[PDB]
Curated annotation (Swiss-Prot), chain A:
Nucleus as UniProt keyword: yes
Subunit structure and binding partners: Component of nuclear RNase P and RNase MRP complexes. RNase P consists of an RNA moiety and at least 9 protein subunits including POP1, POP3, POP4, POP5, POP6, POP7, POP8, RPP1 and RPR2. RNase MRP complex consists of an RNA moiety and at least 10 protein subunits including POP1, POP3, POP4, POP5, POP6, POP7, POP8, RMP1, RPP1 and SNM1, many of which are shared with the RNase P complex.
Keywords noted in UniProt: Hydrolase, Nucleus, rRNA processing, tRNA processing
Record-given protein name: Ribonuclease P/MRP protein subunit RPP1
Curated annotation (Swiss-Prot), chain B:
Subunit structure: Component of nuclear RNase P and RNase MRP complexes. RNase P consists of an RNA moiety and at least 9 protein subunits including POP1, POP3, POP4, POP5, POP6, POP7, POP8, RPP1 and RPR2. RNase MRP complex consists of an RNA moiety and at least 10 protein subunits including POP1, POP3, POP4, POP5, POP6, POP7, POP8, RMP1, RPP1 and SNM1, many of which are shared with the RNase P complex.
Protein name (Swiss-Prot/TrEMBL): RNases MRP/P 32.9 kDa subunit
Species per Swiss-Prot/TrEMBL record: Saccharomyces cerevisiae (strain ATCC 204508 / S288c) (Baker's yeast)
GO molecular-function terms, A-Z: ribonuclease P RNA binding; RNA binding; rRNA primary transcript binding
GO biological process: intronic box C/D snoRNA processing; maturation of 5.8S rRNA; nuclear-transcribed mRNA catabolic process, RNase MRP-dependent; rRNA processing; tRNA 5'-leader removal; tRNA processing
Lineage summary: Eukaryota, Fungi, Dikarya, Ascomycota, Saccharomycotina
Full-protein interval shown: 77 to 279 of 279
Swiss-Prot record, chain C:
Pfam families linked: RNase_P_pop3
Domain of life, per lineage: Eukaryota
Name of protein: Ribonucleases P/MRP protein subunit POP3
Additional record remark: Present with 1360 molecules/cell in log phase SD medium.
A GO BP entry: maturation of 5.8S rRNA
Primary site of residence: nucleus
Quaternary structure and interacting proteins, as annotated: Component of nuclear RNase P and RNase MRP complexes. RNase P consists of an RNA moiety and at least 9 protein subunits including POP1, POP3, POP4, POP5, POP6, POP7, POP8, RPP1 and RPR2. RNase MRP complex consists of an RNA moiety and at least 10 protein subunits including POP1, POP3, POP4, POP5, POP6, POP7, POP8, RMP1, RPP1 and SNM1, many of which are shared with the RNase P complex.
Source species: Saccharomyces cerevisiae (strain ATCC 204508 / S288c)
InterPro entries xrefs: RNase_P_Pop3 (IPR013241)
Swiss-Prot record, chain D:
Pfam annotation, one family: Rpr2
Cofactor (UniProt): Zn(2+)
Task of the protein: Component of ribonuclease P, a protein complex that generates mature tRNA molecules by cleaving their 5'-ends.
Cofactor: binding details: Binds 1 zinc ion per subunit.
Record gene name: RPR2
GO CC annotation: nucleolar ribonuclease P complex
Cell compartment(s), UniProt: Nucleus
Record note on quaternary structure: Component of nuclear RNase P. RNase P consists of an RNA moiety and at least 9 protein subunits including POP1, POP3, POP4, POP5, POP6, POP7, POP8, RPP1 and RPR2, many of which are shared with the RNase MPR complex.
Lineage top rank: taxon: Eukaryota
Organism: Saccharomyces cerevisiae (strain ATCC 204508 / S288c)
Name this polypeptide is given: Ribonuclease P protein subunit RPR2
Amino acid sequence: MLVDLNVPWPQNSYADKVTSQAVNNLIKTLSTLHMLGYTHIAINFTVNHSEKFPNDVKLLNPIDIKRRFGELMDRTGLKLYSRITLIIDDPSKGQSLSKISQAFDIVAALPISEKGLTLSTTNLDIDLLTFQYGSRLPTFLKHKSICSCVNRGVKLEIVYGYALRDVQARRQFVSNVRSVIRSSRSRGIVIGSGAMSPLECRNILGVTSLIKNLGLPSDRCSKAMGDLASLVLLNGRLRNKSHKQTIVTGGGSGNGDDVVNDVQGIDDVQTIKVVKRSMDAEQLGHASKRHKP
Amino acid sequence: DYQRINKNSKIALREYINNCKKNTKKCLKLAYENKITDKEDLLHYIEEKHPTIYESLPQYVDFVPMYKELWINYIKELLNITKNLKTFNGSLALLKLSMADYNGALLRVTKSKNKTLIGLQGIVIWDSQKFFIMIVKGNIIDEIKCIPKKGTVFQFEIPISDDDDSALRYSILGDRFKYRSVDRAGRKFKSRRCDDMLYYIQN
Amino acid sequence: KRRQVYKPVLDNPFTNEAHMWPRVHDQPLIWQLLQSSIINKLIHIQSKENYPWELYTDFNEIVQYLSGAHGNSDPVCLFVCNKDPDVPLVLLQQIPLLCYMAPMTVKLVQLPKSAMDTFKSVSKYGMLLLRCDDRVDKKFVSQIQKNVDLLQFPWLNAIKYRPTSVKLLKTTVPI
Amino acid sequence: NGTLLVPPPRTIANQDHFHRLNYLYQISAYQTRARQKARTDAHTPLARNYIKSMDLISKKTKTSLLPTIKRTICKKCHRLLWTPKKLEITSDGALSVMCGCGTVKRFNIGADPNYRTYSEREGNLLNS
RNA sequence: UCUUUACCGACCGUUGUUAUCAGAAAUUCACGGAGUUCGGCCUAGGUCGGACUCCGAUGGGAACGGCAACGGUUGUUCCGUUUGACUUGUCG
RNA sequence: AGAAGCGGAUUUAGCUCAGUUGGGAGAGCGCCAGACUGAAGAUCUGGAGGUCCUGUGUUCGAUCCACAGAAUUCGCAUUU
Ligand SMILES: [Mg+2]
Ligand SMILES: [Mg+2]
Ligand SMILES: [Zn+2]
């Protein structure tokens, strides 16, 4: 199973309206990621820290998984997650994080300065830390801080699609990624494709070679997409749908229903999951002694 | 004799759950001596030939209506589950389930690190700190079942009063909450590293 | 300054239904015979009070009689006054409870009249337990007990969930 | 004397706690009665456990109960007294109720009648 | 929290705290009932005082119990080093 | 991106920070709303907004007390 968790959405501000051409372009690149092969896609959305945020509930989501991606799902056979990368620069203006967190599934950050990077790892409940690979790194990471942040949770994220943008950006990208691998101790490394087009897509065996040539080993790369990628999905998925990893509204069937794998069988209206009477206390004993299922 | 047992309720509970397991092992031995596979004939066989052994045996047929109806009606009253379902509120319901006690619940091991623990349904007689106690029937087995919580996924059905139209199913994880009910009355559950949950993605 | 605060306190949700004293009606047809019989007992001799009619009027003897010492007399009848002042509530919350676990056919009758302070002020305490084995009195006691004075338990008989009851008490707080 | 304010907005957390306490009390009482009607004392250390946990939850959220509940349950081992050992009266004191464990709960009854508890008085209490 | 071959055991003292309500009482204040013993008036044994023991609905609660701080230990407190080798300078 | 080892200080709303017999969870700024103005700022009023770093245990009850696991950050005759 493969997870691509940083596909960007063609919108930066809530005042802007997405045209149908960008939506059709996203449909074509999802068909591209379905063509060669992938398992999970979590599309990303950029949010600045000092914007004028709407005080709404059902309007914080310009993603619409149900109406357009629910139609794409039946011909696709995959699933989409929605997430926010918090572009936090200065401790001047903030937000109500309990609404923005519980709106989508995964919560991320994007630091620019010193103190924001500390208060993100310290107090802010997020899932992944993304740095600006296109521009200059804010500070150079200390080992005992990043190690304690991985031991607390949140892992670092590398966007190999940002090197495919320009020529000059590749040097700054590799200079950031080698520092991330150096100061992260090769524990919290989750990789993702920041492509805006189907013309910049790659295969697993080329991304593995990219991670080889950057400095991280091969088995640890595939383990990062098998173990480390799908667990930080489950972290935010249990945090924002259910309680703080305590009691879940996700049905535990044999091999088809899961919190991660069965998204459509869960009513995404509030919490619930409508499941038929599969548990009878009257005449059901041990699992190996049953005869009706 | 009777006074020395019930001086501490925990030690007497431990003595009772040990006595139930010993009586179940003796019941299996007397059942293999009986050579009758039917349990309804086996209970009458024990009533005829072993009076003192029959006294500490559980009664699951009695245990189901005395627990399931009270548990379902308590959840239908507590979580405000009525005929009107379109006014539901899920977050406060999950907070109430975080505040409600699971003593007396029907619960099913759906996923576990051990492949043999899954498929077990049972009704809570007592909640431990890090283990779990249920009771399940087999062909002739009536053993008190202890199941670890570190690395297991549990699920329970909340039925609705309509017949075969709609019902709810919720899931808890015993590796997440690992405390007594007394602390769970006051505890506000917080975030964890959740790194050891790979089994839930694995199986 | 004093301020009044209402504090929520959990009630016993079934103590009202556990103390649903039985339905009694057309009761002045009974106190005439009962009071005349009790007075005719209490006139002559203290030995002749309990020698033709065996009755116990001390609660310790009521507990020792219903413990299981005497199992021969199965129909045993009890008369207890409620709605009456100067009656202790500690015994009265435990009298209909202890007769339920008794294996003998114990027939509690709740006397509903508030003005009936005579039987408490005269005999011992206001309660009467006696036996209808071969006495003449049963020849009318079996007549009316099926009519209105039936005593049955609905609360423990069937399986039923009980709704919670949370009341609230007054508290005067000085600051 | 002061200000008279009667609020009927009950709080949701207190309703959750008292529903939890009442559910534990009901399941312990029904286990005890279902065991006591049929046969001998099989799982009498079980239901007591619930009451003990109930009392510990009564220690957590600073909650108080009616004296009917605390009169029903014990004080040391915290068991239900629906089937007690012995009841004695006028044995040179007031009253005595013996239990199986040996802890007694006596009441001053030989002093005077017409004494009610603070929750049983005429106007001090409002239901629901 | 404690004890260690204890052929006898030994939870140190003081101060403050356990908020509101409840209850007679939140620290062996006091108050109410029962029993015993002693003394005075007095002698069908009535009453009064002192001492002990037991019980009294409430609350986690009456348990010299829990928490925090301080010491009588062989008087307390303060001050100084017992720590260097090469190079340079002064003095004999 | 200038380690290593040592002492001190410290983590509470988006931010900067109080605060604590141990029994209520806050102030300023910011956001929204009211008031006000032709409009706006300022002033003023109200509401929304909490993982009191996390965990154990003590207690009847933890921002507070004890322990454990993280760390934040200063200083080392410095402005690299
Ligand atoms: Mg080192
Ligand atoms: Mg070191
Ligand atoms: Zn007891």
